[PDB]
């Protein structure tokens, strides 16, 4: 019972979380494991904002109300070439990554590794934060308030 969650560096608070190396989160429960990190959705003004400080992925996430990916550099792969925050239009499917606000983060870029996941409660599941640079945080807990996402 693991879940593995690839997490990026802050900026202005605003960070990626990826888990089990797939689109695997569903809204509710990307809004459940934002609480875990004692963060939320960002909303777009938050992303924007992250955005400027030098935040950009390749994969989709939620933020509060959209499907979206930060670019900076224009990536044919990436967005289809776009810059800005890209928001996701037409998709079939509900399962993404997320995006999570911590409002205690740095203000600019912080490049740290998460280590810690403060706010998961007590469960089963052996939890584990997989930073970028391949550093690691287990703890054993749960996250999802759903049924329906476990
Ligand atoms: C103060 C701070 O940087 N908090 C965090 C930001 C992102 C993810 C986290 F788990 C935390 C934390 O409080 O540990």
Known sequence: NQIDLNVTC?????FHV????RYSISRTEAADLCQAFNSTLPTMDQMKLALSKGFETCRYGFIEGNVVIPRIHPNAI?????????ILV???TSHYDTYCFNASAPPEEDCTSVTDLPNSFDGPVTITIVN????RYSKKGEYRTHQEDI
Not at 78 to 86: I, K, L, Q, R
Not at 132 to 135: E, V
Request: glycine fraction near 16%; charged fraction near 20%; include cysteine.
């Open 18 to 21: 990826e888990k089990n190396g």
């Open 78 to 86: 990436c967005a289809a070439n776009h810059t800005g925050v890209y």
């Open 132 to 135: 970028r640079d391949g550093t």
């Open 10 to 14: 802050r900026y202005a608070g605003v």
């Open 90 to 92: 037409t998709s079939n």
